[PDB]
Each structure stands twice: as structure tokens, then as C-alpha cells.
């Protein structure tokens, strides 16, 4: 109904990963710790 989604244009290829995703992995460590609980 609301029409299709257009993905954003990528102006440049990322040579690395953002530090946000690094923090996501850092907190995924404690996520795995809670999985161990």
C-alpha cells in the first residue's frame, strides 16, 4: 500500500566497519555470557 522502499545510495565503499558494529560485538560477548547462564 505505502509503496516500495528505495535503498540509500552508497557514495563510497566502506574500507572498514564502523565502531558501532565493534561495540555491537563487544556487547555480544555478554550476550553469549547470558546464553551460558
Amino acid at each position: 500500500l505505502a509503496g516500495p522502499l528505495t535503498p540509500p545510495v552508497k557514495h563510497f565503499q566502506l574500507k572498514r566497519k564502523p565502531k558501532s558494529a565493534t561495540l555491537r560485538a563487544e556487547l555480544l560477548q555478554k550476550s553469549t555470557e547470558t546464553a551460558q547462564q
Binding site: 522502499l5 535503498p7 540509500p8 545510495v9 552508497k10 557514495h11 563510497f12 565503499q13 566502506l14 574500507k15 572498514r16 564502523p18 565502531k19 558501532s20 558494529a21 561495540l23 555491537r24 556487547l27 555480544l28 555478554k30 550476550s31 547470558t34 546464553a35
Partner: protein, 174 residues
């Protein structure tokens, strides 16, 4: 259930199910309003801030929530507390600058640099803009489109260091 319980550490306990469940858009908005009202309390940064991490899942995984997240952090980038000194205010501001640079990396680049230009011209000290440029030129890969240069470089005229600034200016003027 998590949100009305007035959660911090328990958030990190069940962050797995959360980042599993933020993929639902409406749930992402619900968490966004919850963390907005918790973090918008005066002096919520002196006691746990894990909450600012969750926007990373939201904005990265939902494109149309880029305008909300920046339009949240515009308030949080203006945080000022007499208890948490200007040093801690600047730490929180620089953390939010890292978040805003990540959100720029997702393509929300015009209003980010426009607001950065505006608050430099106003509030935001030169140290915060220099740290912004430091993190940006540490993360962003060339080529740099002129739509981004037109606001990023004429505000970078104030400084010349973070050398990556010289490389950026030379590449983007040549």
C-alpha cells in the same frame, strides 16, 4: 515488559533478544521513545549510558529512522550538567559525535554536517568539531562527494589537524 519495568545492566543481559527484536520497526520506535524519556531525565548520564548503544542497531538496520536518531541526539549533544562537569559533558558530546558520524556513514550526511556547521557557527566548541573531523577522516573512505565536502570542508577551515586533515583538504579541493 522490559520498558515499563524501568531497566541498564539487565538490558545488557537480554540485549540478545533485544537486537533480535529491534528488527521489527514498531518495536524499534517503542524502544526509541523509552530510551528518549529515560535519557531525557536531567542528569541521567551520571548513572547508567548503555542506552545510546541501541540506536546503533536501530539506525543501521532501519534507514528511515536516521532522521529520528539524529533528531534525538541533537538534544543530547546539547546536554549540560553542573554536577557532571564540562569535561564529562564533552565526553558525552564526543560519544554522541561518534554516534552521529556512524549515522553519517549510513548516508544521512547532508543534515548531519548542516547541523554541525550551524552549531559551530553558534555552542559546539572547536575541540568538538576537531574530534568530529578526527573520527570522520579516521572512518570515511574516499571518494568524498561534493555534496558532503561543501559543508564539511568550509567548516574544517577553522582547524588543520585531528596528517589526515591535510590529505582530506588536498584531495577534496583538487
Amino acid at each position: 515488559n522490559l520498558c515499563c519495568n524501568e531497566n541498564a545492566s539487565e538490558l545488557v543481559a537480554e540485549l540478545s533478544t533485544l537486537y533480535q527484536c529491534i528488527r521489527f520497526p514498531v518495536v524499534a520506535m517503542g524502544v526509541l521513545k523509552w530510551v528518549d524519556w529515560t535519557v531525557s531525565e536531567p542528569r541521567y548520564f551520571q548513572l547508567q549510558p548503555v542506552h545510546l548503544a541501541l540506536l546503533d542497531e536501530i539506525s543501521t538496520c532501519h534507514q528511515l529512522l536516521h532522521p529520528q536518531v539524529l533528531q534525538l541526539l541533537v538534544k543530547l549533544f546539547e546536554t549540560e550538567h553542573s554536577q557532571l562537569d564540562v569535561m564529562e559533558q564533552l565526553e558525552l558530546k564526543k560519544t554522541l559525535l561518534d554516534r552521529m558520524v556512524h549515522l553519517l556513514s549510513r548516508g544521512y550526511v547532508l543534515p548531519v554536517v548542516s547541523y554541525i556547521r550551524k552549531c559551530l557557527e553558534k555552542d559546539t566548541d572547536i575541540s568538538l568539531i576537531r574530534y568530529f573531523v578526527t573520527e570522520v577522516l579516521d572512518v570515511i573512505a574516499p571518494p568524498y562527494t561534493s555534496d558532503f565536502v561543501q559543508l564539511f570542508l568550509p567548516i574544517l577551515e577553522n582547524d588543520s589537524i585531528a596528517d589526515p586533515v591535510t590529505e582530506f583538504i588536498a584531495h577534496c579541493k583538487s
